[PDB]
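User: Please run a holo structure prediction.
Assistant: Happy to. Please share the sequence and the ligand.
User: Here you go; the ligand is zinc ion.
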Amino acid sequence: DQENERNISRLWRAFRTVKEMVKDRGYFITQEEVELPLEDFKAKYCRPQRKMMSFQANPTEESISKFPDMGSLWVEFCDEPSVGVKTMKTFVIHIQEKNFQTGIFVYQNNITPSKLVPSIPPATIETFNEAALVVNITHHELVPKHIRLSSDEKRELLKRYRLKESQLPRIQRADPVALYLGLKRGEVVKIIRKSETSGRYASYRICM
Amino acid sequence: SFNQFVDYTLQDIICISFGKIYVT
Amino acid sequence: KGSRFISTLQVKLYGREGSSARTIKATLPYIKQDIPIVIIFRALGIIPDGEILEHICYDVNDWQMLEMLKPCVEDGFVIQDRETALDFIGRIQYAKDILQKEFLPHITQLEGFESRKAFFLGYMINRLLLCALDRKDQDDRDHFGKKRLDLAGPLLAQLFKTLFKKLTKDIFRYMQLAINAKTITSGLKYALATGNWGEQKKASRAGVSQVLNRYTYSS
Amino acid sequence: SLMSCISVGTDPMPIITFLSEWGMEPLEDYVPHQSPDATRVFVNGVWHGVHRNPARLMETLRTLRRKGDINPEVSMIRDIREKELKIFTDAGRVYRPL
Amino acid sequence: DGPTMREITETIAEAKKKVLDVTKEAQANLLTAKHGMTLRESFEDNVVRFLNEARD
Amino acid sequence: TTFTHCEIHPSMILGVAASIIPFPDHNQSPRNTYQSAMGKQAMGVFLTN
Amino acid sequence: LPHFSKDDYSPESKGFVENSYLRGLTPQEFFFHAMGGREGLIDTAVKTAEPGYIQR
Amino acid sequence: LEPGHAADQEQAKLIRSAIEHTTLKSVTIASEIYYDPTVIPEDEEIIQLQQSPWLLRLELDRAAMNDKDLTMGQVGERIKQTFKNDLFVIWSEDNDEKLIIRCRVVEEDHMLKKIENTMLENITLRGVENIERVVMMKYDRKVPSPTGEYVKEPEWVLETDGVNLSEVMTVPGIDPTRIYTNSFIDIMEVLGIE
Amino acid sequence: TTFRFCRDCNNMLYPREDKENNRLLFECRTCSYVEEAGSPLVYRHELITNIGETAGVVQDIGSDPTLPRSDRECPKCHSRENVFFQSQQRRKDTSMVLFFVCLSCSHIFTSDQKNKRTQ
RNA sequence: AUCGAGAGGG
DNA sequence: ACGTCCCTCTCGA
Ligand SMILES: [Zn+2]
Ligand SMILES: [Zn+2]
């Protein structure tokens, strides 16, 4: 029975938070679904093998109003800790032949260059890791609620506050959270936070 | 410092051949 | 007692705790790289790689001390005799001059003393190690007894010597009494009169001849 | 401060001989593998030789200046705990009276 | 200098005891190497708490 | 009582100027460092010629 | 202090000035006061330009 | 700590010693080398229950395995595992007279002196690295007593002397949602500009 | 290790193994001298240093006015006349126990009560 | 006047 | 890479 069970915990937590991010990003997940403990996880998923836990959630009916082009997102996992282009061509075609919108591929230990992610216009694919997915950064005391702004919720800040894109504070594409919502360049955000003064300041950041 | 300079350690610096030296 | 000599002597234990590369080398007047404590011992004359270990160690029972003097021996194993040694300092004999002369010269730079130049060099690599093996507190560079201070005397000394300086090579020009007399005077004048302790007219520990205070006796 | 003075410069020879004449083995005829309790001599940063029992060496000296045969500015100091003996005819030393 | 300075003279005394104890006690190794700091450093940082609170 | 020597009067550690402070053994150490180079900015009989 | 035991960690010579200003330090106590304020005097004339830079 | 029993001195006591970074160099009190194809007098009983005759016998310290309180059957277990089956190793027991490990290479005079040091500094035992030292202490923290008011219920917290949150985030039984590090520059990389 | 050098070269000696008889020899690489090891203890690291924790304490050691004297007792002659001093191994950790030294019989002995030091 | 060095005043 | 703000004197090419 060894102490693989400590490696058994450190991917179910990751799972829950990996799935957590899909609800916030604008997909269909229930809190029960993410709350599924390891006891029910192992029972339904064991022995721990990852190609079994691949999911495909889709857009909500609220997300399709302001984001009506955010289509089908496929998420397949890998069993081999290291991954090469061979396996990556097997995963890219899943979204390639079915013509889906986005894809988040989790690797649990390492991937080298063999560099093909950005060659499916129109679909850029996020690539996370179980080492940093295990504990969610967004639940932190000091991580404010960033909220995605639309293409019409953007051109509405840029007129009201009399800006040119330049003039807006900034978040970077690799920002822990931007990745956690996969922010593209020209996407904005409404970082809302408690303040000791206003009581509820409402900054804004764009993303490059 | 000056005395011990003048008296001795000044002479030491004589190395057409220079010898004992006097200052007024 | 005759110069200033700015040639200072470096001797450093490479490799920190947990490195087994702890080679001891030295950097010496007019020689770029650093020379294995061993090589320099041979060009001295102390030749057997072990013959030397009694110059370093004043009790051949400091086993832990000796265990570090190990790499250096192999570091400078590649050279074995005296000749071989100072060609690695490069007809090329010139190295014997440089050791004899601009090196550990507060001893004498007559050749014949080749055994207190070594029995010293050891005494240095000795004291270095006591600190490596925390049987010593590294010295106190802010320790006053170790500081000297020149007063007027020495201060004229440097000026008068460095003055009479190009007096005698100006008299070497009275051939190719009627020598120069002003330069010793107007020299001494200058510095005691600028505070920029002379040095021809390039400035230099400026602010050393200060005019006396007179607002009260005490001051 | 007030009672501080400063060293002038004395000569070293007439004491590096007063050592040869009271217990000093020069080092060209020194190897420690017969004498480890060899205590060491130092005059102004020069290791001239070696002596065995410093007891009446550093104490025949310390009453040598006391009467005046050696100059009173030069400083004499032996370090029992490390078996070393440094003497300074230096010029620059800041002696106090005691 | 009333009995006040007469009693301020003992706190300057009793607080040498509160550091006279930890004296040969620390040089009998009995000094509890506190969580982290050395034995040496525990002796300072526990005596200065006995001198500062002494002065105060 | 391992005493090699004895100090002449402690008061001689004082400096050329500060030597003139009335009871510095009752004053805060930074003040004494001022009276020190303050009697150097004074008025008085600097010589007699 | 060349007036004190070697390898010694006392307070009466690691800097604890028991006497008061009213009373009057001894040359020991007096000396250590000195060392302390100097760095104090160094803090004010020397390192006063640390935050003058920060400000520009 | 974690929400529930963070008033539990002991619960930290293992998060203390579950990251406080211990290595071989930590306990080894001496590391000797020997030519012996089992000479050593007192090792005879130990050897009871193809290689190379080059010995490597590093000895640990009684108090060393108490402050960090390591296990003799685990300290060598990672040495055993670090070099796969390329090193014939077996230790003693925790109730022994003197704790010692013996390893064989399975010319190699200095080639084993190779894993002289390699074992010492680059072989970590019980903890996550960079956190060179740790210390848990109590500090009061106000929180609401159900009755409605705020109260004075303290708790423990493990203060570090190094910073790699990148994965002291994910340890179990802390409060990842609360952990704090002065390195506002690491906090920037881990948790977001904002 | 306390090892030695050749007798022909006075150069140090790098170990080697009797690949037929199973024995250890102390080679030489200057000359071709050899000899068979005394003990099998080739290398030692010793990380927790303890050599010289009383380093330097020879002839006139109750002399250095510096160090006062104790009124304690010696484990043989029992002289309340005896000097003292802290560990002269200057590390940041080593404890403040004091290795006394007797003026009268010149033999070391701690007051360390947890253990009991020999040197 | 200009540059260079020097002691004090907060 | 620059290295707190201002102010009063005094002196050598
Ligand atoms: Zn040989
Ligand atoms: Zn005795």
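Residues I 6, 8-9, 11, 28, 30-31, 33 surround zinc ion (ligand 1) (CB under 6 Å).
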